[PDB]
From a paper:
Most insects, including human-targeting mosquitoes, detect odors through odorant-activated ion channel complexes consisting of a divergent odorant-binding subunit (OR) and a conserved co-receptor subunit (Orco). As a basis for understanding how odorants activate these heteromeric receptors, we report here cryo-EM structures of two different heteromeric odorant receptor complexes containing ORs from disease-vector mosquitos Aedes aegypti or Anopheles gambiae. We determined the structure of a heteromeric complex formed by ORs from these species in complex with a Apocrypta bakeri fig wasp Orco that is amenable to structural determination. We find that these complexes form asymmetric tetramers containing 1 OR and 3 Orco subunits, where activation of the sole OR subunit upon ligand binding suffices to open the ion conduction pathway.
We first focused on the conserved OR10 receptor family, which detects indole and derivatives in various mosquito species. We corroborated the functionality of the AaOR10/Orco complexes by heterologously expressing these complexes in cultured HEK293 cells and performing voltage-clamp electrophysiology to measure their response to indole and o-cresol, canonical odorants known to activate AaOR10 heteromers. We therefore determined the cryo-EM structure of the AaOR10/Orco complex bound to o-cresol to an overall resolution of 2.9 Å. The OR10 S7b helix shifts diagonally outwards from the main channel axis, increasing the distance to the opposing Orco subunit from 6.2 Å to 9.7 Å. A conformational change in the OR subunit alone is sufficient to open the pore of the AaOR10/Orco complex. Therefore, the presence of the OR subunit is sufficient to impart odorant specificity to the complex and lead to channel opening without any concerted movement of the other subunits. Mutation of these residues to alanine decreases the apparent affinity of o-cresol activation, seen as a right-shift in the dose-response curve assessed using an established calcium flux functional assay. In the o-cresol bound structure, density corresponding to the hypothetical lipid is absent. In summary, by destabilizing the inactive conformation and stabilizing the active conformation, o-cresol shifts the receptor conformational equilibrium towards the active state, resulting in pore opening.
Numbering used by the authors:
A (entry chain B), B (entry chain C), C (entry chain A): 7 to 159, 168 to 243, 313 to 474
D (entry chain D): 1 to 375
Amino acid sequence: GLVADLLPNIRVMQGVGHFMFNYYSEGKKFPHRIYCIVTLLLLLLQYGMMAVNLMMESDDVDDLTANTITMLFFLHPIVKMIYFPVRSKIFYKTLAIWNNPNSHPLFAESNARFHALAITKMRRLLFCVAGATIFSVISWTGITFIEDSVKRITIIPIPRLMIRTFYPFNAMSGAGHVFALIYQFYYLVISMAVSNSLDVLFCSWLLFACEQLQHLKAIMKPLMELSATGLTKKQEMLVRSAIKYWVERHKHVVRLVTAVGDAYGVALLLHMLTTTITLTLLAYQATKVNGVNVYAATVIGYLLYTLGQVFLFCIFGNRLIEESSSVMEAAYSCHWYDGSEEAKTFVQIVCQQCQKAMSISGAKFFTVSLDLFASVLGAVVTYFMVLVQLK
Amino acid sequence: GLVADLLPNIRVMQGVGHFMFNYYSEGKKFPHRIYCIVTLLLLLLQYGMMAVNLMMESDDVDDLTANTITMLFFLHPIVKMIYFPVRSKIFYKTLAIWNNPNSHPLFAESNARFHALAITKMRRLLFCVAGATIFSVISWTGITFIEDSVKRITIIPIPRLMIRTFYPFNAMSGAGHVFALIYQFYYLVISMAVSNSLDVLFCSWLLFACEQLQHLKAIMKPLMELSATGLTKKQEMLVRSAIKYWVERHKHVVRLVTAVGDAYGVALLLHMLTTTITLTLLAYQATKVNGVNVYAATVIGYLLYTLGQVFLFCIFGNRLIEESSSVMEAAYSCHWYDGSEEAKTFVQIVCQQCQKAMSISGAKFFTVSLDLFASVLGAVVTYFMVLVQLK
Amino acid sequence: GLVADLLPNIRVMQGVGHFMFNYYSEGKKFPHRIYCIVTLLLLLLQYGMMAVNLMMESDDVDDLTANTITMLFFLHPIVKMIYFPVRSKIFYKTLAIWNNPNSHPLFAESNARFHALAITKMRRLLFCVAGATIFSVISWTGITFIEDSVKRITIIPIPRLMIRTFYPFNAMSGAGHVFALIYQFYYLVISMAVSNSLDVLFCSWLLFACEQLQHLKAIMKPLMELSATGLTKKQEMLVRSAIKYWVERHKHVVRLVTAVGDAYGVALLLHMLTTTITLTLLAYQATKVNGVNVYAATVIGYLLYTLGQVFLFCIFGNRLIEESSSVMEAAYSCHWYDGSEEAKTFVQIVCQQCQKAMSISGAKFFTVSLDLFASVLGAVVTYFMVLVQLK
Amino acid sequence: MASILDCPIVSVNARVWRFWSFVLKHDAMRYISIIPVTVMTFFMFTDLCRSWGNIQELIIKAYFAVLYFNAVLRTLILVKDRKLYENFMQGISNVYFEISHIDDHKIQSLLKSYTVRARMLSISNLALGAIISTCFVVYPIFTGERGLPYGMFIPGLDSFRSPHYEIIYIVQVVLTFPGCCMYIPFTSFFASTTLFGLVQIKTLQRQLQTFKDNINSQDKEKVKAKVVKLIEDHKRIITYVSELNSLVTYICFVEFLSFGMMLCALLFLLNVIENHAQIVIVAAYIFMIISQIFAFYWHANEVREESMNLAEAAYSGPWVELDNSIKKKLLLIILRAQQPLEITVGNVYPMTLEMFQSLLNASYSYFTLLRRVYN
Ligand SMILES: Cc1ccccc1O
């Protein structure tokens, strides 16, 4: 079912160490556990070293703010990869939702067409997010290498590393520098991979829901045409079967949406809290930006990544909302007047249900939508404005 | 009726100093009333001392705002204990609303199951809030005893007491110290108990309403299934009776919600006014925090208690709202297409009515929901950020 | 169709600076193409000269802010003129939408009356906006001529030019001075023409939609009267055709609204972004105002122009929203109880459809309405408050 | 024939407006009340413009000038649109008589309760206006200096020298008597009108829940007629609310702006004065302002909530046993009723208590701005 469609996403998140010991033979079940534990340990060790570094650099506020922004950035994937294992039951329940779908002979072709379209859109989203993460890692490494690693207190050389960190080694000579560079590349890659892979899984769920809704409207039209004449008993049972198919598939979509909503609603609650703190610190940092030096590039990259994650969630939530509202519109937009009273009643009840659009909530404290992205962006820009005015 | 279910809460209120002279034998009606009076006196009496303290602490804004925060927190319970006697008639009207429920032979088992579930959840909530109150009292005692009693103007010793109040006695040597400690412990316990008990009664009303709504949906399913199995006279009468039961029970739930809304909406208006002022003062205090000293613990405890009350209220209001919306959704999710004109019309009217979600308002100035808690939290956070940056 | 009604606006766009190689003979395709290229080249040339002028005047903040405000205001038309050509297909699809409308032998008179009213209001709006732009350009020229071209650094004679610009010519003697004067007059005229012409095209689309909605209501009343008696088969066909006409025309209006939102949905986004920036800078400039004849006049004129553009968009968005709501209201407020069953179900479905008002959104980030204008005004006044307080 | 003066709800405002010949009669009193006060407000604004020097006089003037400008604006709208107000009040009287003729205990009790509430609100508003006008006149006495009840400057005219001062004072006093009047009743009228709205709304609710009482169930003709009547009453309520909405809508846009400025002014004034008892007078000013604001917004909000409760009461009826058609009609009634019968501010924003809180917050923000600049 839905496990097959999202198989590339499942496998990519499994390969980076995102647990999910559910979709392969028992043989691979054992080594994957050790792999995931090792990835967890490495990520946590690097984070702890970063925390030690923050504790050492608490004498000033600029370094403290930069460190705190880095820690929130690298807290996102830790929180995500600790959140999935505890809630793995809900995730597996969601992924197995569409194992047994609806079926009517007349509406099979549209079902297949929109299923294929959903699969293609999911693949496109996965590839785009993977490319974005790869670009982020490469840009981070490049900015690390062009930038002149040094500290101003007098000027003191600093080890040239992508993430400021405290290391028991020299971290500045050949062996230590090489090991630190490789380890930090691995860190960056795995952190971005885990976070963006879980996010893309959520967005792929939403994409499948939206495409199923589009199929529902596209068959809404010929269904109502089916009911039109008056009708012999056989055509009457045909209309009954078509209405049954439509209603059952709509309820299936609602079930999928509710499951996704609860699970990644808790997920987004945590995500957006962390994002709010990070964006406050980033507004303060941007207040310090002058010229087109490397500092500006780093600040702009941090802001771009944070707002990009928020925008991904918001755009797919908006897609779901607009798809439900358009289900209402397409329920109205057919030739019900020529139909029968049963079909007309079915149309009225569908419109009643579609009055309110499906949405995903962050633990009921908000709804993910381009309105939420607009609100966060407005808050960021306003806070930056008052910060510059104060300075 | 609903007084048997709410009996432990009523008994806690009666024994802790509320004017609930309705639900026992006429004998202890006499002493209890007298007892109640004394509690009031004592509360207000201690308040007197606190008040006069504020008068001489009006030298610097620091102790002035600390005293103001204490005064508002301890104003809460006095306002609630004086509010209940004034509005006792409506409270008793609400408590007696559910004395004569409807009944249908087929939906009796579900009614019993969901009534039991409601009672269990009410007891769970009561125990949780009692535990939270006891935890707060013991935390106050511990914070008082671990911290060092001293006032800086030069350092001058001050009596080691839970809260800064004026006592005509020495209040520093043994006898005055013990008397003051006992009085303060009694004051704390009684105030928190009365306030949280009234809040828990409100939330228990909301829980009962939500569970009745859940019962309504759970029977909405087999109701439509009954209608589907076109219909003979006996079947038509049975479907008519089932629809009657459903509609009458829904109207009963609406009645309960309206009564609760009136009473505790006036209550919530006053509550949120007080909490807004308290949160402003607490944000100002939080801007003064440095380190992880005891002062930070006191400020965090004040914030946690205030936001916990606001939360509890918003949690249960949002539960009611989402339960009504879910009543709409579950009205959609039955096999109405296979039903009858009467049952389909019943579903249509139920959905149209559920297009508006039951909610509790604070005297129409707002609606209690998780959105309200989010707004309060955001307001306090933004005010704190503005104050800290402006400094 | 809709092109015939809007021909004056289409020609105002076409002949001034606005491409649109679609609605004239092949002979004018090539000369008009070259003319558009020349207009774009001249506008971009003057824009670049303004930018380079801003570059040297970056030492101070007052001159930098004034230059930035001018740069953004003249950014608006450049964005508009390079935005229409890329989206030419969607704009041409918005037009030619009403080429084949519905028709009934009974509702033709109201259709003609409301079509005439829509055309009259379109011409009224076009003339009003043209007069506003002419007033703006003449006011600009007057204020430049009465203004003293003196720069304080020491007092230096600035060239008495209408828009600050760095010109390779002398720009002081007769030749360069007059060349620049006529060039800048042409720049202002063309920029305002292009911007306000596309804005008025959007508003004219909205006016057409609103007038069609009014026609739908005005025939909804006699439509229900027609349905009301018990109807012979011929009357059944007549009422069926009336329902079909009403539903088809409402769907056509919905199609027009969606097409207008698609064509002009992201021009609003860019316009509001550029506005926001301009309003911020103008709030600072007003904070610099001290009741001077020219400075205050210039700031007030800039604010008036920006708020007038936003106000026009919001006015017509609110018109569409209120028109849809009024569609629901006028669907209810008629004699739908005596109408046949089909007419009653038609009213039910129309009322369900009209629950939500048609709206135009800035790419789903916001909706153009008088609420948006109120929010913009509140934001600008609040930022002015902050600027004055933080002095 | 029901008359405007016959209906208790609108009797007080109708009498007050007819005394000045605003809405019921035309005579010299209309102009004698309008023109002198308009001239007073104009010279008040001129003095405000000329008083940029010191902030205290500026603020007190500005407050009085805005108050009197709003009063004159309300009066000009009232006289300009006298016919529509007369028609609205005549319809109110007719509907009041119709409702009073009903034979339902609860409907009659609701009628009397709301009628007494409206009358008490009107008389209380008039009394508060009288007292606050008295405070207006006595305000310049506590300061000690040769002040005026309201600032006013005539081009090249000395007001603090020669006996001329006194005359101004005296005439100003009489100018107060129309002023307060011209302001108060409309507010009350709005309240009163809105209250009747609620009455009407609530009446239908009862008739929605008891329409089947004493009506034979077997015959559908009478049930159909009764539901048709319920629909007609709902449409009548909608029309009433829409008309009141337009009138008070334009008035309330101007009122929102003026009230924001006035509350700012009063809050700033209360925090600067240092006289013995003038602070109590400023506090009375604030009480008056917020009382009017609360009356407006609270009554509009109740109109909305009672329309939604009209929807709810449409649901809670004897609709289970009715034929299919009547159930469809009640479904349509529930559909329409769920939209609040909003009374909008300038037709842009529905009038609710949310806008009341927003107005208070904006006034406090203006007050903080004035505090910062003045310091
Ligand atoms: C001008 C005025 C208005 C309202 C109340 C009293 C008063 O003197």
